[PDB]
Symmetry: C3
Subunit: 187 residues, 3 copies
């Protein structure tokens, strides 16, 4: 069992189906960024402590879902042998319910908050911004190729989820958020 | 209060003023990278311990300043209703004074150092390299559109600040820097 | 000794040799991404504990090697005064021996694993994905300019190394890997 094949040593790689692409191809960058986000979520999850245990399982669930998203990003729309498996509806409503809940419980802001606080809150804000980076790359891809737009919907909602969860993480250890001192009332 | 509007679900988003852009637009990537840096700084700050307390407040101040920078990056130069608010002079001199101080106190190198050491030092080196990534994206933007060049000046100086601060973090816990074994005398 | 020269304040910077480039030039992005990876490895190394001590020295060695790689990425192929110093053969075989060893010791999977587990394992998966991001940028560069292809070979192998090491980190604290629930038998 050798995970190193050396077939990518020249800069090309396989996607789902028969096609090979350069590794800097927008498709390969898109699910590559999703994989980096997925790894960061894993890292975020490893920071869970006794105060924040309630967040542990949904972070693991998000990791499962990112694999589902990345599958589809790796799959060309005109591939006869492989289909899109990701449906946005239920995973996205599930995120929305959490955003709603977490928004309700934490103290309300007007203004932008400093992305920080506890180590977990801060990690969740990093997740937020990696998701948004990945989102940009999915959009780059979408502008050149037919994608499963359900993936975009979910990844879009996901960075709102990370924002909500990060505030909730602060709430769980009673760490106050700090406001951006020059913020207008934006929320 | 719903932070999810679903208006970005198709890949376009508002900037400051009336314009909408794709999320992979260089402008949106520029202040997006600044937001990721801002989140990383928050994460860096959450690692502060009893040895490194003296670094806590200026990291928070940097977060405030990154919001100021990102405002301007989000603002088109020809927007009649919105202006640039960021002036580089005082924030940049403030960084320079810190670079000078931290450079003076820590042991002097000739050679490149391994970016690492304590967890905070290492986090500061990550901040250094995220700032430089963000800087590249600001430059990408500048090559297509008129920006506030003060933002570039500050973000440029900021990665030197992170280099200096990271060495200082090592000094604060008396963790020696390690040299790149094949370095020429570069400093 | 001032690390801030202010020469980059306008968005251009020197590479090895006489040439200046914009900071968003693919060459500058390539060794820039390598520097970010290098910093992340430093951060990964700072997480080493009593269970995972055996990983400490090779992470430091990787940092040395990334400087060697970045040197060459910074060096134009037609630069009369500066040469490529990086040879892939021995560093790459060294990675392969570790991949082989670590693959042998850890429990075998069929299926994709969730990138996560212990804090070090998870950090190693982040390293994995930053290496792959950097790899894409090296490929971007290669498609425009002559590079030392040895660097590509090594950086390619390196993300397999990080995958193997991350599983090994889990093994060292007896943290089980979790499987992607919808995985096909991919390994
Ligand atoms: N640098 C990269 N960034 C993002 N995705 C990648 C990268 N390289 C490969 N991939 C994708 O992820 C899968 C696994 O990567 P892997 O390293 O096994 O591919 P490879 O580099 O082509 O092969 P090898 O490393 O064995 O030479 C690939 O089949 C490809 O779809
Ligand atoms: N992926 C992204 N990366 C960087 N910046 C973004 C991204 N998406 C939106 N932005 C910018 O940051 C602001 C907030 O993002 P937000 O998610 O609220 O926007 P949206 O995606 O357009 O809306 P929604 O998520 O409600 O559908 C936006 O108005 C836009 O300027
Ligand atoms: N944003 C960046 N991203 C990646 N690499 C960079 C960046 N800026 C400079 N470099 C490269 O790394 C070296 C060190 O960066 P440094 O900040 O010293 O350069 P500079 O910005 O041109 O100068 P200064 O900061 O003194 O105005 C440079 O000579 C250049 O090759
Ligand atoms: K491989
Ligand atoms: K939103
Ligand atoms: K400098
Ligand atoms: Mg959004
Ligand atoms: Mg600079
Ligand atoms: Mg590979």
């Amino acid at each position: 069992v050798k995970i190193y094949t050396k077939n990518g040593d020249k800069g090309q790689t396989r996607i789902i189906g028969k096609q090979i692409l350069y590794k800097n191809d927008p498709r390969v960058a898109a699910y590559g960024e999703v994989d980096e986000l997925n790894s960061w979520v894993g890292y975020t999850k490893s920071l869970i402590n006794s105060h924040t245990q309630v967040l542990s399982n949904e972070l693991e669930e998000i990791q499962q879902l990112l694999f589902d998203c990345g599958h589809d990003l790796a799959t060309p729309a005109d591939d006869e042998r492989h289909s899109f498996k990701f449906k946005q509806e239920q995973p996205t409503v599930w995120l929305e319910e959490k955003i709603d809940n977490y928004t309700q419980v934490v103290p309300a802001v007007k203004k932008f908050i400093l992305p920080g606080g506890t180590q977990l809150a801060s990690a969740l804000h990093v997740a937020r911004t990696i998701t948004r980076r990945a989102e940009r790359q999915i959009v780059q891809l979408m502008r050149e190729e037919q994608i499963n737009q359900d993936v975009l919907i979910f990844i879009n909602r996901l960075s709102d989820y990370f924002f909500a969860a990060a505030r909730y993480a602060n709430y769980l250890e009673q760490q106050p958020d700090m406001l951006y001192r020059n913020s207008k009332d934006v929320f």
